[PDB]
Amino acid sequence: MEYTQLGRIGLKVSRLVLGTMNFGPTTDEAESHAIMDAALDAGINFFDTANVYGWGENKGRTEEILGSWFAQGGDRRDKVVLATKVYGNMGLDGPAWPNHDKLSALNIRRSVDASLKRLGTDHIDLYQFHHVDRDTPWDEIWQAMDVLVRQGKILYVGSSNFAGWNIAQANETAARHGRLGLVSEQCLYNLCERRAEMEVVPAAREYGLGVIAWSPLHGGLLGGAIRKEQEGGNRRAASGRAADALKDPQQREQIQRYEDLLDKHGLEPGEVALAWLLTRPGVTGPIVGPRTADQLASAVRAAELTLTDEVLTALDEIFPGPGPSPEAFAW
Amino acid sequence: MEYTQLGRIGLKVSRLVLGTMNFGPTTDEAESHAIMDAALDAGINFFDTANVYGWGENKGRTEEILGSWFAQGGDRRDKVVLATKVYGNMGLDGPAWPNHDKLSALNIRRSVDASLKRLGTDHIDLYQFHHVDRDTPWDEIWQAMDVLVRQGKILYVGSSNFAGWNIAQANETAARHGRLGLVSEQCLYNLCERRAEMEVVPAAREYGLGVIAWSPLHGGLLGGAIRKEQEGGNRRAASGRAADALKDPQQREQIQRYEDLLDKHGLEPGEVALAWLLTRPGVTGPIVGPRTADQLASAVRAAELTLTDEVLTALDEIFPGPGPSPEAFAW
Amino acid sequence: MEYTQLGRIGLKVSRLVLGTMNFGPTTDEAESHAIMDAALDAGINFFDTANVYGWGENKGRTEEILGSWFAQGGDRRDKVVLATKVYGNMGLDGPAWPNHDKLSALNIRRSVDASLKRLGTDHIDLYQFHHVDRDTPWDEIWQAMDVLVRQGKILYVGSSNFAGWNIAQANETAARHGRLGLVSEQCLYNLCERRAEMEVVPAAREYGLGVIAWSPLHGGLLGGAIRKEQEGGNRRAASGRAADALKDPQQREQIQRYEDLLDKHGLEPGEVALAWLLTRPGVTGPIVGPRTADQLASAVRAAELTLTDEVLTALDEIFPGPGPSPEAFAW
Amino acid sequence: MEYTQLGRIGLKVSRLVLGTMNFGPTTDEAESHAIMDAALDAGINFFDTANVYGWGENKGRTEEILGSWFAQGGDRRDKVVLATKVYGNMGLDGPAWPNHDKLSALNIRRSVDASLKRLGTDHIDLYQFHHVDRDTPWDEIWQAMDVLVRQGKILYVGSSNFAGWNIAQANETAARHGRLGLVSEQCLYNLCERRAEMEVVPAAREYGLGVIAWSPLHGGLLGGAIRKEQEGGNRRAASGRAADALKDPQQREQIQRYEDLLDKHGLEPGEVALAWLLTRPGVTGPIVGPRTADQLASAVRAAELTLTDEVLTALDEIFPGPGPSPEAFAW
Amino acid sequence: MEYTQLGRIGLKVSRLVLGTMNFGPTTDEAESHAIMDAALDAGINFFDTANVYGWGENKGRTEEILGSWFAQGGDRRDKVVLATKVYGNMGLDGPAWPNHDKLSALNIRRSVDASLKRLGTDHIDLYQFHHVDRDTPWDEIWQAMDVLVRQGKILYVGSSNFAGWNIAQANETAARHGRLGLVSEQCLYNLCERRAEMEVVPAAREYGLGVIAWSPLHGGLLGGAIRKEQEGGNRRAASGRAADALKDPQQREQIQRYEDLLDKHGLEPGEVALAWLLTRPGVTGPIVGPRTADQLASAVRAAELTLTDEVLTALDEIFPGPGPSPEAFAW
Ligand SMILES: NC(=O)c1ccc[n+]([C@@H]2O[C@H](COP(=O)([O-])OP(=O)(O)OC[C@H]3O[C@@H](n4cnc5c(N)ncnc54)[C@H](OP(=O)(O)O)[C@@H]3O)[C@@H](O)[C@H]2O)c1
Ligand SMILES: NC(=O)c1ccc[n+]([C@@H]2O[C@H](COP(=O)([O-])OP(=O)(O)OC[C@H]3O[C@@H](n4cnc5c(N)ncnc54)[C@H](OP(=O)(O)O)[C@@H]3O)[C@@H](O)[C@H]2O)c1
Ligand SMILES: NC(=O)c1ccc[n+]([C@@H]2O[C@H](COP(=O)([O-])OP(=O)(O)OC[C@H]3O[C@@H](n4cnc5c(N)ncnc54)[C@H](OP(=O)(O)O)[C@@H]3O)[C@@H](O)[C@H]2O)c1
Ligand SMILES: NC(=O)c1ccc[n+]([C@@H]2O[C@H](COP(=O)([O-])OP(=O)(O)OC[C@H]3O[C@@H](n4cnc5c(N)ncnc54)[C@H](OP(=O)(O)O)[C@@H]3O)[C@@H](O)[C@H]2O)c1
Ligand SMILES: NC(=O)c1ccc[n+]([C@@H]2O[C@H](COP(=O)([O-])OP(=O)(O)OC[C@H]3O[C@@H](n4cnc5c(N)ncnc54)[C@H](OP(=O)(O)O)[C@@H]3O)[C@@H](O)[C@H]2O)c1
Incomplete structure (x- = not known):
């Protein structure tokens, strides 16, 4: 396993981060636990989850699945850098009760306690804002996070x-009063969606944040979704983001040229899309x-x-990116 | 004439800023002077120029044309908010001698003295960085600007x-030590290019910067370029940014839709492109x-x-924008 | 003559401040100079003026009258704490040209140089904002005033x-970055108008500002205006603030009781109104x-x-004040 | 027993610091307890240990031996300034699992709790970084240490x-936000290795740190290891840093001139090496x-x-040092 | 010519810095001027000098030689980043009059004015402390420098x-109050003397300082001094640092190894010693x-x-370096 510092900080992480969003709604608990043990065996020490994972009536399920994994012992908790999230509504789907979503100090207090209980641990290593909340100012947010750090x-x-700004x-804001700032940004970044290159990744690099790419296969769309389009199973590429893109002719053409490109070179689409992100600076x-252990391997x-x-240049022509602002739209 | 504060600061400016880029290479000194006289007569108090305007061997010409205008007295200098720029290479076009472009304290010192000399004035009201310089840190930049403020x-x-970040x-950085930071950002923003909406204008709005949009007509492309395409004269729409667009079938189609829409509503294309910017938040x-006194009127x-x-919604249809990040590309 | 520190600072001032607003529009130059000579002879070392004093086409006249008084030599400038003001429109009466009024760094730059020219002096001891400007932030204002201090x-x-806030x-804001803040507030305060007691004077006292009361006779209303009502001449009491009040039966009765009370006590109304202000804490x-040298004596x-x-108690009955907020309107 | 302030802080310490590295791997628990009782009886109030001491499969053993010593009661813990360390791998010898060594906030959290448990105490008086960690920034480190201070x-x-820098x-970094900084540096310094004089000790003295010298006899080399080379026993000088230095004829000769000089002066080599360190400024x-009670006496x-x-001069000729930088290598 | 940023700042400099110490005592004015024109022709934009250069009764002569060079015109001053130095005694060689050497605010004021006059310029681009002054505190030094920056x-x-610390x-200290700190350290660093590697270069790199190496050939010792040993000319290698080294058998042996190695590779000793420094990180x-225009070429x-x-490995065997502290002397 290749390791690296998480941006500027002293934390060292595997360059593959184990996402757990499938654990619960797509992967059942026993198979979820098998993937996590396999991940640890391969040297992956960095697990991402969220309080909302599980979805709908089952929000919090994913954190529970991790909690029972930890309770098996074997230094599983001690070996993992455990990351979860606050922002999402943990109640009935639809409009949330006020302050039961977003980033007020009130919702941060109640969300972290609920996550800690479900995860069966006394601390979270990396607590992440799931989304920017334009209505909460940074002196409130850092007050609340500093309470949790000190506790x-x-x-x-x-x-x-x-956004980068x-x-x-x-x-x-954190630096003015001696607080450690954000240590990482988790943004959508993959071959199909490169606009984090404009400002998100540049700002993250300047401030020394790690950058971890979610939906690196664009929800399975880069995993060989065309070749597999008629296959059954409970595959993520059959729904949402991937299925949406495949209905659209110009994006379907993109994935078609992508799977054709990799047929020529004899490479696997899912693996190339991951390997491509590993080449991007920052x-x-x-x-x-x-979804399975074979997909982890x-x-x-x-x-x-x-x-x-050659492959890198060809991918670039199929999936051009904007580069940084202001050059991306001005000069 | 409508006035507004420039972002958060006490300076009041006309919502039309007089650009001077045409003065010299496209508009001669006499017509330039008349345009500026008409600008003042109409209540426009805010002029934008740059050291490099004039182009080629005539870099600095524009500042000199403004200087001979001020030299006529009549309270012209006292009434005008004078903006100019540093970053550009003022020597022979091509690779600049080291530190004769960009934002080092060395180049700021020599550039500002040259501009004051050409403009024939002892102070510049708004001194602008022409472009981000990623290699000069902000404590160096604010040191150099603070020397100029205090002098x-x-x-x-x-x-x-x-970029927004x-x-x-x-x-x-400016606020940590009590310096007035940036008061305005001058960015490319028009119907044709709306990507400043993702992060540049959001960041400016959060920090209370004025936002002044350069090439509001995309270089004359939105001024009725199709209807005018076969005309003579020294037209900016006949070259550069506007000519390249009218070559691409889809960008041309976009502009054709625009000009056809406005003919049905009795509106002029250049006037609508400016009026549209005036509706944009921030x-x-x-x-x-x-280029002419007529165009100023x-x-x-x-x-x-x-x-x-109805016109605003129709324009959104022809010229869609991305809105802010992260929503623009994630959720 | 009684001297006191101006609030918390080391400057020592006479407890009578010489106002010059009459000098020009109401008192001619010759007697203006007479009043100033007699003021200095009585030990008054603190003169208040403004760039706009003179009024209309004669704005700046008062400063010019002070200028020619200092020009007489005699250690006059060295012995006087000279105070003037920036904010007002020095152009034609009516809507001002943008940034030719208010407190932008631009208007501060131009106003102070024109005041120093009229006063015939190289420095102003106390440079006052004539009015709050809600559109100019304090980091801009303190930038501009710091330039003046350092020069x-x-x-x-x-x-x-x-306002107090x-x-x-x-x-x-000044303290944050090591600047000496406001040293004094000049506010309307007299027997007829006591609402500066609510917040302005409490805030001034908390922050250690001098408090100097403008129109201490309410524009002559408290100077015997009813007794003198039928006399001719260019008395201030005949017009403006004093005239309006006397046309109101409620305020006229107040002044009647005032003048009758001091008739019974053998006191002069102008002198009592000044002595009253000298008893107020802060x-x-x-x-x-x-208006005359006699009125100075x-x-x-x-x-x-x-x-x-007994007299203080009776004045309080005729001219009740609100005291401080929140008690003034809540509890 | 001579006492001194630890650098600039209020803590008073014996000028002998009791090292505990030998307790466990070289000296058994009962002899270790005997030495610590004798240290206290001698007035030594300053004990140094580390989480890794005990070595190999027995890492943590030394801290346990001190923990059983404190658990005897008798005001031992109240009397001792207890110092331990964080940085070392406490797992199996070899490359550590990520964040189970070095100075991340993660490893600091897990290491201090493990040390407190082994030492059987609720606080550590002096918690030391065992080694610089170039990958962890100081605002992360001080956040972590400040959590422990405030708890x-x-x-x-x-x-x-x-290093000195x-x-x-x-x-x-600590002082910027009012944290107490480093109070002491523990560096390698003895007659054989004086290069801490170049920058480490000068930096410590400028910032008012204590300087406590580890391996003061260079692992037993300066304790008469030539004369005792044929001796048997679990001698430290028979192995490690000392044995290496004696395999090398060039420094073996230095030790020979040292043991010869102290033969003439009737002095003990171990005692002289410690007494020499007590003469060094800072x-x-x-x-x-x-290793024994007798070596403590x-x-x-x-x-x-x-x-x-006479002896200091002769020692300085056998064992010259570089003095401070830049003079040590430039001028 | 290769260019690079000077550490973290916006200044761009040639990777060759023209030293001027020879100009005066070794190279006469005419050929000093020729070398400087040749440097500019080659694209070298960064000149180093000092007030003392000239030496003895001719201290200041080197600055005058640069001054007459600039006075020729030709954009010479505008194109050059001019560095000079303060600390040295500018009076009679021997013990300095108090405050006529070292870094008091008093000596800094008088030294900079003398250097500006001799250089025939109104500003120094890079003003350097010639040596650490342990007796002057940094708030005194930064006050003095800030006076010069603002002027x-x-x-x-x-x-x-x-030293690194x-x-x-x-x-x-600079950053606490918004001052730009040191932008470069000029230290002794070459094949013969590599101890700047322990702590000076690492500190410079951490703080983003440029590192410019003085006496990069060790005063000519690395320029072929053994092969040239019996030659005439006013050769720097015939005296001083290089001559004393060739006296010592161990040091002479090292240079012999160097020159013999380069004969096997068809490389020149002066050029290799320069090229070697350009490979060192930071x-x-x-x-x-x-000394001559030919040596500049x-x-x-x-x-x-x-x-x-192969050559870099061989050089490292002839000329080993210590690497960074603490590893250089501890672990
Ligand atoms: N911060 C946020 O807003 C956010 C949002 C989403 C996700 N995340 C995080 O990012 C993690 C990953 O997101 P994601 O699940 O959408 O990633 P993804 O890789 O884009 O999609 C997962 C799907 O890709 C396929 N796949 C996975 N590995 C493959 C491989 N080696 N070869 C071929 N196909 C492969 C599988 O598709 P099939 O099922 O069709 O076989 C799998 O279900 C989440 O678990 C979560 O931790 C964060
Ligand atoms: N900061 C930067 O990087 C940057 C870059 C460029 C410009 N600027 C600034 O922004 C200012 C404006 O830039 P620009 O000259 O490119 O602006 P623009 O408005 O996009 O282009 C100017 C052209 O549009 C046409 N036009 C202008 N006004 C019109 C009207 N009322 N009705 C119809 N057509 C009209 C004319 O084209 P025809 O000649 O074909 O008639 C005119 O020459 C410049 O003067 C300069 O100050 C800044
Ligand atoms: N900061 C501001 O916004 C502001 C506004 C107004 C004034 N000020 C300053 O405050 C100063 C005083 O304002 P003001 O002129 O309105 O003061 P005032 O004392 O309220 O009114 C002046 C008038 O009161 C009468 N008077 C003056 N002294 C008298 C005395 N000893 N006995 C009897 N009557 C007397 C005269 O009225 P008759 O002519 O009727 O005899 C005189 O013209 C001004 O000179 C100016 O410096 C500042
Ligand atoms: N921070 C770090 O990196 C680091 C590294 C090492 C140590 N330390 C600390 O520094 C402490 C001392 O280290 P160290 O054990 O290597 O010290 P040391 O004094 O250099 O070596 C100890 C050996 O010197 C001999 N000795 C000790 N006292 C003597 C005396 N009075 N007369 C004659 N010989 C004597 C004994 O050798 P024989 O057994 O051969 O008789 C003893 O085992 C450690 O306990 C530890 O707390 C820190
Ligand atoms: N901050 C300080 O304390 C300090 C101290 C000293 C110097 N400096 C600065 O560093 C600059 C350089 O120092 P330095 O003069 O001692 O440099 P140096 O390169 O170590 O010594 C100069 C001598 O090396 C020889 N040489 C130079 N270039 C050569 C080449 N291309 N090929 C072969 N030989 C060559 C010449 O020796 P021969 O005469 O024998 O031919 C020349 O006189 C000085 O000008 C000064 O700016 C600073």
Whole structure:
């Protein structure tokens, strides 16, 4: 396993981050536990989850599944850098009761306690804002996070779905009063969606945040979804983001040229998409979303893959990116 | 003439900013002087220029044309908020001698003295960085600008062609030591190019910066370029940014839709493109680029236009924007 | 003559401040100079003026009258604490040209140089904001005033017509970065108008500001205006603030009881109104507004007067005050 | 017993520091307890240990031996300034699992709780970084240590095996936000290795850190290891740093001239090496590493020794040092 | 010519720095002027000098030689980053009159004015402390430098012959109050003397200082001095640092190994020693000290040299370095 520092901080993480969103609604508990043990066996020490994972009536299920995994012993908790999230409504889906979503100090207090209980642990290593909350100012947010740091309930704070200027404002505010700022940003970044290159990744690099890419396969769309389109099973690529893209002709053409490109070179689409993120400057790693143990082993092979300059140049022509602002739209 | 504060600061400006880029390479000194006289007569108090305007061997020409205008007296200098720019290479076009472009304290010192000399004035009201310089840190930049403030050579500092996160870093750094930060950002923003909406204008709004939109007509492309395409004269729409667009079938189709829409509503294309910027949240105003006194009078009418909701919705249809990050590309 | 520190600072001032607003529009130059000579002879070392004094086409005349008085030599400038003001429109009466009124760094730059030219002096001791400007933030204002301090063009900064919370925000902002804040507030305070007791004077006292009361006779209303009502001449009491009040039966009765009370006690109404202000806690002193040299001598006698508890109690009955907020309107 | 302040802080310490590295792997529990009772009887109030001491499969053993010593009662814990360390891998020897070594907030949290449990105490008086960790920034480190300070788990923070500029950076960062910085540096310093004089000790003295010298006899080499080379026993000088130095004829000769010089002066080599350290400016004292009660008594005699200038000169000729940078290598 | 940023700041400099110490005592004025024109022609934009250069009764002569060079016109001053130095005694050689050497605010004021006059310029781009002054505190030094920055007499401040911890203390102190810190350290660093690697270069790199190496050929010792040993000319290698080294058998043996090695590879000793420094991480460049225009051309060739791994390995065996502290002397 390749390791790296999480941005500027002293925390060392595997360059594959184990995502757990499938655990519960797509992968059942026993298989979820098998994936996590396999992940630890391959040297992955960085697990991402969220309080909302499980979905609908089953929100919190994923954190519970991790909690029973930890309760097996064997230094599982001690070996894992455990990350979860606050922002989402944990009540009935639909409009939330006021302050039962977003980032008020009130919702931060109640959300972290509920996550700690479900996870069966006295601390979260990386507590992440699931999304920017424009209505909560940074002196309120850092007040609340600092309470948790001092109480030993969290170690580090991270962001997710921030704009680049939110990262700058957050960490400048933290720095003025001696607080450790955001240590990482979890943003949507993959071959199909590269606009985090404009400002999110540049701001993260300047401020020394790790960068971890969620939906690195665009929800399975980059996993060989065309070749597999008629297959059954409970596959994520049959729904949501991937199925939406495949209905659209120009995006379908993109994935078709992508799967054709990799047929020529004899490479696997899921593995190449992960390996491609590992080449992008500033990227700590993809957050892999295995549904099965074989998909985890596939991600592990993806981390050992070297893409040639030919393949990298060809991917760039199929999936151009904007580069940074202001050059991306001005000069 | 409608006035507004420039973002959060005490300076009041006309919502039309007079751009001077045409003065010299496209508009001669005599017509330039008349345009500026008409600008003052119409209540426009805010002029934008740059050291490099003039182009090629005539870099600095524009500042000199403004200087001979001020030298005529009549309270012209006292009435005008004078903005200019540093970053550009003022030597022979091509690779600059080291530190003769960009934002080192060395180049700021020599550039500001050259501009004051050409402009024939002892102070610049708004001194702007022409572009982000990723290699100069903000404590060096704010040191150099603070020397100029305390010497009385400049009043305010502004940015141009920044990323949103550069605005945040700049003003947070300035605030740690009680310096007035950036007061305005001058960015490309018009019907044709709306990606400043993702992060640049959001960051400017959070930090209380004015937002002044350069090339509000995309270089004359939105001024009725199709209807005018076969005309003679020294037209900006006949070259550069506008000519390249009218070559691409889809960008041309976009502009054809625009010109056809406005013919059904009795509106002029250049006036609508300016009036549209004036409706955008956080926009101080467009930096108009008249080539003729007639075109300046047209802009003054544009500032009095009220666009109906039907025209605004139709324009959104032809010229969609991305809105803010992270929603623009994630959720 | 009684001297006191101006609030918390080391400057020592006479408890009578010489107001000059009459000098020009009401008192001619010759007698203006006479009043100033007699003021200095009585030990008054603190003169208040403004760039706009003179009024209409003659704005700046008062400063020019002071200029020619200092020009006579005699250690006059060295012996006087010279205070003037920035904010007002120095152009034609009516809507001002943008940034030719208010408190932008731009208007501060141009106003102080024109005041120094008219006064014939290289520095102003106390440079006062004529009025709060809600559109200019304090980091911009303190930037501009710091330039003046460091250039030696001013010594101290004071306010006029501020709200109490403006005084707090201004001096907290200055203190943050090691600037000396406002040293004095010049507010309307007299027997007829006591609402400065609510917040302005409490905030001034908390922050250690001098308090100097403008129109201490309410524009002559408290100077015997009813007794003198039928006399001709260009008396201030005939017009403006005093005229309006006397046309109101409720306020006219107040003044009638006032003048009758002091007739019974053998006291002069002008002198009593000044002595009253000198008893108020936090008040440095009144800014007297003599129209004649006799009225100046009267002010000097007011500063030697001791008002009995009986007279003070009776004045309180005729001219009740609100006291401080929140008690003034809540509990 | 001579006492001194630990650098600039209020803590008073014996100029002999009791090192505990031998307790467990070299000296058994009952003899270790005997030495610690004798240390206290001698007035030594300052004990140094580490989580890793005990070595190999027995890491943590030394802390347990001190824990059983404290558990005897008798005001032993109340009388002792207890120092331990964080940084070392406490797992199986080899490369550590990520974040189970070094100075991340994660490893600091897990290491201190493990040490407190082994030591059987609720607080550590001096918690030391065992080595600089170049990948962890000082705002992460000080956040972590400040959590422990505010929870009462530690009192002071110290460093060990730092460069001089690490000390400066650490304490400047601490001071910015009012944290007490490093109070001591534990560095390798003895007659054989004097390069801490170049920058480590000068930086410590500038920032007012104590300087406590580890391996003061260079692992037993300066304790008469030539004369005793044929001796048997679990001797430290028979292995490690000392045995290496004697395999090398070039420094073997240095030890020979040293043992010869002290033969002539009737002095004990172990005692002289400690007494020499007590003469060095800025040195709090040496960390003695007795294997036996008798070597502790010998160290106590060493602290009462007076080395004549004759001997100091001769020692400085056998064992020259570089003095401070930049003079040590430039001018 | 290769260019690089000077550490973290926006200043771009040639990776060859032209040293001027030879100009005067070794190279006469005419050929000094020729070398400087040749340097500019080659694209070298960064000149180093000092007030004392000239030596003895001719101290200041080197600055005058640069002054007459600038006075020729030709954009010479505008194109050059001009560095000079303060600390040295400018009076009669011997013990200095108090405050006529070292870094008191008093000596800094008088030294900079003398240097500006001799240089014939109104500003120094990079004003450097010639040596650490342990007796002057950093708030005194930064006050003096800030006076010069705000007066426009200097732009940047640099250090020379500092210890690593001095760099840290200097820049932390500067940053506390918004001052730009040291931008560069000028230290002795070459194949013969590598102890700047222990702590000076690491501190410089951490704090983002440029590193410019003085006497990069060890005063000519590395320029072929054994092969040239019996030659005439006013050769720097015939005296001083290089001559004393060739006296010592161990040191002479090292240079012999060097020259013999390069004969086997068809490389020149002066050029290799320069090219070697350009490979060292964190080194901005060597400060070349040509005696002739031919030696300047040879340095320019050295900047285009690529040293093979074989040669770099062989040089490291001849000229081992200590690497960073604490590992250099501890672990
Ligand atoms: N911060 C946020 O807003 C956010 C949002 C979403 C996710 N996340 C995090 O990012 C993690 C991953 O997101 P994701 O599940 O959407 O990632 P993804 O990799 O885009 O999608 C997962 C799907 O890709 C396929 N796949 C996975 N590994 C593969 C492989 N080695 N080869 C071929 N196909 C493979 C599987 O598709 P099939 O099922 O069709 O076989 C799998 O269910 C989540 O677990 C969560 O921790 C964060
Ligand atoms: N900060 C930067 O990087 C940057 C870059 C560019 C410009 N600027 C600034 O922004 C200012 C404006 O830039 P620009 O000149 O490109 O503006 P623009 O308005 O996009 O282009 C100017 C052209 O639009 C046409 N036009 C202007 N006013 C019109 C009207 N009322 N009705 C119809 N057509 C009209 C004319 O084209 P025809 O000649 O074809 O008639 C005119 O020459 C410049 O003067 C400069 O100050 C800044
Ligand atoms: N900061 C602001 O916004 C502001 C506003 C107004 C004034 N000020 C300052 O405050 C100063 C005083 O204002 P003001 O002129 O309105 O003062 P005032 O004392 O309220 O009114 C002046 C008039 O009162 C009469 N008077 C003056 N002294 C007298 C005395 N000893 N006995 C009897 N009557 C006397 C005269 O009225 P008759 O002519 O009827 O005899 C005189 O013209 C001004 O000079 C100016 O410096 C500041
Ligand atoms: N921070 C770090 O990196 C680090 C590293 C090492 C140590 N330390 C600390 O520094 C302490 C001392 O280290 P150390 O054990 O290596 O010290 P040391 O004094 O250099 O070596 C100990 C050995 O010196 C001999 N000795 C001790 N006292 C003597 C005396 N009075 N007369 C003659 N010989 C004597 C004994 O050797 P024989 O057994 O051969 O008789 C003893 O085992 C440790 O206990 C530990 O607390 C810290
Ligand atoms: N901050 C300080 O304390 C300090 C101290 C000293 C110097 N400096 C600065 O560092 C600069 C350089 O120092 P330095 O003069 O001692 O440099 P140096 O390069 O170590 O010594 C100069 C000598 O090396 C020889 N040489 C130079 N270039 C050569 C080449 N391309 N090929 C072969 N030989 C070459 C010449 O020796 P021969 O004459 O024998 O031919 C020349 O006189 C000085 O000018 C000064 O700016 C600073």
